[model samples]
Target: AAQTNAPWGLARISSTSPGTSTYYYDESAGQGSCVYVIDTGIEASHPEFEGRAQMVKTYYYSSRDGNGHGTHCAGTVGSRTYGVAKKTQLFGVKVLDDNGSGQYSTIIAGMDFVASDKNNRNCPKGVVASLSLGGGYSSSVNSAAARLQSSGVMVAVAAGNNNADARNYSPASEPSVCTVGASDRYDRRSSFSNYGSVLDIFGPGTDILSTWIGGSTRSISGTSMATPHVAGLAAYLMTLGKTTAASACRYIADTANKGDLSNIPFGTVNLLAYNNYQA
Candidate 1:
């Protein structure tokens, strides 16, 4: 039974503990929303997506995910089995290469594409973007993210795996995006997760099991893994009428499980992401 149960990250966010094996969510569950995954790209053919995921644009060699990072993040966002918002439409915007590397310009181009996508404007509930990649602070990338937010897309960014202050990272440091840190199943900060005042919330990031390329699954760790969870939550919230980027960001932080995580750095926010599910 445990082998086929919801992943611990999903279970953890729906309850306060002792955590359960089930993940309870709202009936809306992101039914009318769309999530743009700006990363390596997604294997839209992966059965886990149930024909709901697709590559909308690419800055890499091809739309296919030569690297599996984007697919994993997409799975956590809305895959049939490993997802937080199970019914949300997912679009892939490949910004990173097979080596999981991208320049600031390429990243911004992907952001711009999402901002201009017609589906982004037509989605019934709302739009959200999951950005699970980060690097040294880039003012250009920051402005691009701000523009994306101003376009009415709620953006969720990774705090980085550098173990340093997240304030030194690009989109994560951008005030307009919801910056997410990493936490373990035990509600403790992951050792490698970047922290500091820039972070708006934490999510399950360690040993997260999600869909991978070639229709497989893998367990991985990093703030990259954590960011999608919040992105998924934002999508779920959008279905509940918190459609604007500002409202979604504020509700995510305001309703989080406050000060529940341990080993939080001095300047970091100690709140854990919650889905407001009840038995």
Candidate 2:
């Protein structure tokens, strides 16, 4: 059943208004799609995953999530309680460390693994990858992301939390990925969220509740919390036959609710991500 008292972020995406309380979505949302979470890691045994989440590969030393960021982001992508797509398969690709930090080389390694795995037989259609980390621009990082997209993975990345232009950050600055900014329940851009023309869409980021390490749940904020929502949406769109990364991005942009958010910086797009699910 759809959540009648869903989390604010979940409810916000399924509705056009700011005050909605229900999260309406297709019963088969993301049923046949896969989402690769490239973050710290994930607690695959967490109950929210229902055995659908697994650690496929790790650039970090261990596959376990010592930090909760990756699990939380994964929950927002497809956990039973807080996900945008409730049935998408989740693959954890540990790039960031337990301290929630990593080098560009590690990040690139994770992307390479996803691209390689995606090409393997038996991989599901509509492969999507969620990235919730970023720093100053790096051409290598940007090229890696572009290559991931060219391999047919729909990518969504967080705009950095620097409160400046997203164009100054890597991955988010890359045109090939869906660069996501953060928004609050009041239809305003988050004060700490990076903005500018590089942002593809805004998603609810403030006070988002999601699965955490140790089989618990947590509330967090930042563009990190916002990115998986769009990533999951891309998977949902793919299950509906938007197979290519370009088409998924285009559909997301075309169906997004526009001019609804405030505090959008001068060059930032005024579009807010929506799942196009009506009640």
Candidate 3:
């Protein structure tokens, strides 16, 4: 999902906004739902993570921290105050090694693990998963990640930081997958962001300031960081207790802002209309 390497070039589709996350929390947060953000890893001991990050599980596929890139991502999506769904519990999945990079095989394995954990009574049902990684439009990634979705696991993936086309990703391009693109503070399309009909919605992806490792914080960027805003928004709205994935995507599609990008057909993340739906 786009943690480190925010890629300076490309385009500035969305601006980095920490306050936006705060507003989202203040607006949501009803009964405090639960979520799982599978990424590099989490501090697991950060002050903001206290009582919030309920390490339901930990998959340390690697031992390196990679400058806490994954942990920083966790903060934006689930960390206290820094994220939109601060009260929700976020379980970390270390699929990417320390270099902030991992082979598709490892990610597929993580997907399997997540699916297995979701079925356990010890794990909560209908948990939304925030995934910031994608392996090009690989049938293997789709089939495996879809396996989790079919099991009631909602996934949010960074459209990919490659800046090329959207068809080059496993999880993002998967028809049923919710692909997220990065937008700068100005609402401009990141030149590197891959946008297409396959993209679901947009979020705060540019110049994002979030929590790093060792109790540090810095400004990072990426559709990966932006993906969490929508992911958090989903959980924040989930307090209703009976919303579906299609409903959530529909809401964003209806309310998402319009404009941005020169080449892309339409430039907008589509937020605002997430709540209210039927069975």
Top candidate, metric lDDT: 2
Q: What is candidate 1's TM-score against the reference?
A: 0.96
What candidate 2 gets wrong by more than 4 Å, as runs, is none
Q: How would you encode candidate 1's per-residue C-alpha lDDT over 230-252 as one tens digit per residue? A: 99999988887855665787788
Give per-residue CA lDDT, model 2, range 189-257, as digits (tens). 998999998888999999999999999998999999999999988887787675456678778888899
- Among all windows of 10 consecutive residues in model 3, the one with the lowest summed lDDT is 7-16
> Can you write out model 3's per-residue Cα lDDT over 1-279, one digit (the tens) per residue?
111233221112112222222131233442355556667777777787775664445445334355587777777766654665556667777877776777787788887777777655332224667888776678888787778777666677788777766767768887675678876655566667777767877666767777788888877788888777767666655655545544555555564554433345444333322322212
Native-to-model Cα distance after best TM-score fit, residue 83 in candidate 3, in Å:
0.3
Q: After superposition, how far is residue 266 of candidate 3 from its true place, in Å?
A: 5.9
lDDT of 2: 0.90
Candidate 3 deviant stretches above 4 angstroms: 1-32, 54-66, 121-125, 259-263, 266-279
